[model samples]
Target: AMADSELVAQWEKVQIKTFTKWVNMHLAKKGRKINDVTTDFKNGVELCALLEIIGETTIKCVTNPKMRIQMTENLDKALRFIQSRDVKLTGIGPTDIVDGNVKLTLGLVWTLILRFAISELSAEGLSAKQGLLLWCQKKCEPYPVKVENFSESFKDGKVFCALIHRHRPDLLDWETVGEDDRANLEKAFDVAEKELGIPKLLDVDDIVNMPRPDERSVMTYVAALYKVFSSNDQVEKAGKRAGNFLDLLRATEGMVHDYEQRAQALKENIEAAINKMNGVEPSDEYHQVKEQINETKNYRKGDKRAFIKEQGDLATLFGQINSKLRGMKRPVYVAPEGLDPKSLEGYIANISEAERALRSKLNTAMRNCLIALRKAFADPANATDAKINEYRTFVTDETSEAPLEEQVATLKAKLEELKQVEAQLPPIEEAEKACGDANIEDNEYTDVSFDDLQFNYEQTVSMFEKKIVYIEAQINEASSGVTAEQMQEFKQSFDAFDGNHDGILDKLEFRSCLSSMGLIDIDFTGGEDAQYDAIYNNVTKGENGVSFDNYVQYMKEKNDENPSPEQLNEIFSTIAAGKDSITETDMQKAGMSAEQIEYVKANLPQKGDGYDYAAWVKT
Candidate 1:
């Protein structure tokens, strides 16, 4: 028997091996494990950040496996060693230790990093536990089925055994059992079998109705078999079972049939409910109603052009309603008087009457007056280029003084009507002023100033510009020539090539339509046999598979050597610019002329036809 010190040393060595093995395997295969609570951390390099939550609270009077106890002690020591003690990990102040202490410290430095990590995980609707479990299952091997002590393991094992005995009660002498846990084991086994729908291997008749008892009782059959099997042989079986068990436990795998049926049922129910509520089938009528609701919710009255736009929106909505009613398979009849056909027809007729009346009331004179008002307010100094050109063109074209007189007369009457409306409405300037300084200038005559309009427009435009800048910054950070944005542009060009809009690109469309565009194909597949497999593996990450950002990043890195649209065309043209190989379609996408392409082609630095521009650039 080994002494306590020897045992401790042996255990520590085994543990260190386990930790080192896990880290090395992760680095070799997965590149890095994200959860390694270790003393050494490197900046700008991927590291597994193992956070130490409060240590597990022990349950008194509950005995566990001896191995589990040892593991717990080792982990405790490691945790204690990681506590902040003015030690540094690399250049960072807060150190990560293979061992650590715990005080539940959350501050600006540590807490913020934790919060960001948590938020990133949450954005995908994944819990931290789920993420960790996925990482372990994919990145780590030989994961324990149950992480508990011997007592709990035995208790669980017995429960599983009882479940097996339930179906074949006569297999063992339950009355003679000393431990109540035996019955629980059989119970658990039975539950698992039923839930998993696993067929029984042994015949129920053999166990229940056998005249002579065998040395092995059916209740303790698995345990007896386990004892007889050699450890090496058992290990082989374990490896096979591990793979099978993992496949069974995966939630998404082999779930297509179940999910499809559920989704179909839910969709049908939802459509039926919607049809009944609307008193119409889910045709254009329902869509028109929703679109109208959206428009009404977003509506706001501002300048003359805006008011006209609102009116046009209402007109289009009415047209859609009419079309929907015409297209209905059957006449929608509602018993409720409010929704009855008679009431609906009356409402439609009233709308038509109102529309005709409004059209006549508005006329050309009112439109011109509104346009003048808009022009005046949109540019107080009348310095707007478009407006100035419009005035110059108007003065040059219309020589009649009578035409100008008619315009003046129209403005006067419209201004009076505007004054009447203004009297009834709350003062516009008050609302404008109440908005605070708003970095805007004051104006007389008009209630709202051009400065305010310019200010708001400019602010909105600036916001959009900033967002573009951010996206551009991310793209530029990559050292590769082919960026994500460039890839998107190429994709758009390809789609345009397939003018039929069939949702897929055919060979002709792919090759000819965007021929000038740099359609770079990455060959991660070193050989034909491994191509598809490699593609699948690289595109996916962890257990949940590839996220949007990761997938995008992967594609960029994969096609890193590919030139940008312009660069690709430039290089290609230098090889065969004016040849029959080039077309106008290619010229447009590549942003080069046929002559330019030909000129580039003639100045060949190519040693052979085998020369690849993208490959050379990378070299």
Candidate 2:
């Protein structure tokens, strides 16, 4: 019910990105100050503005009927549900409907934007800031506004002050705005100015007496207030710099660096945990490299925001806020007040539900993905051929063009199919349930909309797909015709060759196996003499078994090693020559025609001694 499993994957993605960006923001900010790296607040803000404008333009330009139909359908659902008198019978009264719709819309926006951010989060040292930018985008999108000061000034209270100067000059101008607005503005500025350690401004209010929300000015006022609140910390840092860009950048950079270092450490720890989970050694080198990954893992050890232990906590906080707004009974300038309040509330509630559902599903997917990734990377011997293929494809090229929502849906459908299959495969629920209270359907709860949820879901699907492949391979291998005795013999051979039971047979093992078979015992460690002996032995007795032709086949089957067609020909040529000193003409006599010899010659690695026969053979 807690949806922990579902959130696991998404959370990892979120954490990785969060930590990465957290570090980079500080580092970049610092470099700008100490290393003369240019600070580009203006550039950043302009980019954000441009993107927002472009996004809206794109939305308006959508000519696709299907997309338009979907949007219209959702909108209609909201409007109809709000208008229906019967809807008032539900807990979501008529008055709550309109707000609910808004909330739902907002949730959709947040979810979609967050999904896009998954890619950006994969970038080094920019995940967290990107997430913040995403948050800013959401806030600004709903209530678009232009501040008087530049982006740099926005980072501090300077822009806010400028805004107040432009709009409510009396609060800041110390000359006009009369008493009421001036007094309110002064009160808000007093706390802000003092907290920031700026020179004292005229006192009027504290946090409590900050400002009264006018019904007609809800969106505009809320947007400005939210910006003020959001930028509070940044503004304080700016205050310390006292309007000096260099000083502010330096200070912010230090803070960012601390965040990144901590984040990097956390990422390393999480990856180590994952390795342990997959039974892989937590190698120091691996740890070092994983930390360099542009993302953070989920379940950051010291995150405070994760402490919400119950849905009630969310309900209480959000509900109280809603209650306060309702009590104020304010009017909306853009839309009529008391006009389908219930519909608004219903829309908000549905969005909240959708957010929770999305987060839960996403988290699960991510966790599974990580597990599969670890398995494939950690145990290549037992790894599924399918998983390896998936990895190859992922590394090499784009595999799918489905939007995230569609992809997630497909994965969920697959997961359900798997669950059904599992259910049919002997009722193991008793045992599984005994192992823990985590039922198969337990991850249906959590309501968080953090970006990590989607990430986790994708990863989980990958892991599951990989595991299926791995298990299927094992089953096939088991069924391959090998009697118990033959199996034992193969196992013994494997054991002898496998020095460590790490389950891989490297080149050394293959050589040792050949020696045991007694075809040739020459130390073929790269020398003309060794090559001559190898050729003589192969020609006379065959290296692995059978005639020279079948010798290659035997080697392929016996040691799970396959030589390319060219390599087989090269070996055959060397064998017929009976000595490493055999020239290209001799190679032609051994079955390598002039063209084949030329190909080998062209590709062979050069060495100082006699055309490096051993190196050529190896090639």
Candidate 3:
């Protein structure tokens, strides 16, 4: 799944560009960075340096890492360090990094993005992805965005516009975001980087061209936004809760207001959570239900109005004050009637009970949601399997009455759909994994595992990939109006002229080579010797001649070289000499072969003793 060639090919140019900048974002501080993801990591020195810089952690390695083994060792250590930090890398050995395989190399960087950029992040207590998703869902709430996933949701760029406007209301009016997706993305990236200090990590073209933007690209961008806007470490920010005496009550009035607002919000949150729990219809699928469950948990990680976990802080702040008062031999400070210890404790008790109860309900509701998803997944008509079979059938169905271009379009669209299906499969597999205990008797349980889905999906992808290759060859031949047969003739002609079996045709050989084929043109410019001499010299620069490879390549570059009337007339003048007509002696003086002379005479009509070459050229 990780190193599929097709998916690797499909890595967003925007995402790769975005990824380079993200790596540079960390490494720029160290006065080092990279331009290309695939080639830049080849030496392994920069690769290892990038890891330490990105992790803000260090590793020991050979300084330059020039030799293969030394580079491998450096890369090996970097990878091991990443593994030590628990980033799961698949099919990526140190060799893949040192050898500079683009797929795995950029994929390795992507894996890095997944771990350092997307996963390890703790925006508040929520994990990077879920946390960032929730923030977007919250901010994009007012704008017309139901950001279901990172892809389709961000492509049109409305969601990002809404996100920026929601935060930096002073920055721009959302109404100005236009019908053009690229412009909208450009505007958003511009505003974020210029005003908000968030770096532009994405290209507008990458987000705009594809129907589904890369999940990793959007996640990387949104994570930066969350880091800037989430205003993190809520517990640390509230350390004044535990700080000092009358100062404690000095913070009390301020504390009560903070607590009041957060407490009310928390209360409202639980009520909403309960509503979300109850709103699950039988029609609800795992994906939607999963969002609800995750969001509930994500919000739980948010500021619980400084109470949920911080309620003890409120209690301890007061208890410390009362203790200090008694030690000083003074009266204990009394609170307002409703703000007394007993009353505040009662409210805290209620909240604590209700919040825990909400979790209980949510957990049990999750069970049913998983079961329903399992039942849906186990239906007789499994869409995943169906799509897989449909894909298999289509790729092999050569008899289908469709134009080549039409078939090409269908396959392209199906491939995109296949990706969405494959992306969805892993989550669906979790449903089965979760439902292992909830398996119903007499139901159509799937024998298909996640691997089964992927096995078939991968088989289909590889099959279509080869199909696309072959079909494209056929299309090129058609578009060029040159059949395989015509190319075969050219190949044979080149072989006939390759004297001494060298497979290369020099100028002297090329003359006879073209002469035998009845092509009388000197193909090179600036007279034959001068151009061919330069071509042989310039071709290798090191010194060599044009092989058949170069010949065909030259043919392709020239397209077709049927000599024009001007060039043909120039040839005629060579045999004709100073006279208007060339007699056999004139042709013989020109050193034309008997065969060449006969060929010339057949085309030119005789005028008295010699052929009237000048009049013949006019025709």
lDDT of candidates 1 onward, in order: 0.37, 0.38, 0.67
lDDT of 1 by residue, 1-619 (tens): 2246654444333333333333333344444443432322222122222322211222221122244343344434443333433222232232321123221211112332323222223335775334433432332233223422222333334423432344334544445343554344444444434643332323333322322222112212332122223343567889999886566435323343333343344334434433433442222222343443333234322232343443444344444444444554423222323333344344444444543443343343344443444434434333332333333343334355554335445434433433333232233334344323322344333454535444433343333332332344344555545554564554445445655644344433333432344333433343343443454455553323333344345546747766766676566666545342444345457677778756535643433442234433443
Query: Which one wins on TM-score?
Result: 3
Error of 2 at 315 (Å): 53
Off by over 4 Å in 1: 1-444, 447-555, 561-600, 603-619
Model 2 lDDT tens row, 253-350: 45444434433443344344344434422222322324322122333322212322222343343344345445545331121232223333443344
State the lDDT of candidate 3 residue by residue for 4-33, as single tens digits.
Answer: 555545665656777777777767778887
Q: Count clashes in each candidate, considering only residues at least 3 apart in sequence or on different chains.
A: 41, 55, 1
Q: Highest lDDT: which candidate?
A: 3
Candidate 3 stretches with Cα past 4 Å from truth are 1-12, 120-135, 230-619
lDDT of 1 at 324: 45
lDDT order of candidates, top first:
3, 2, 1
Task: Give the poorly placed runs of model 2, Cα more than 4 Å off.
Answer: 1-454, 475-570, 574-576, 585-619
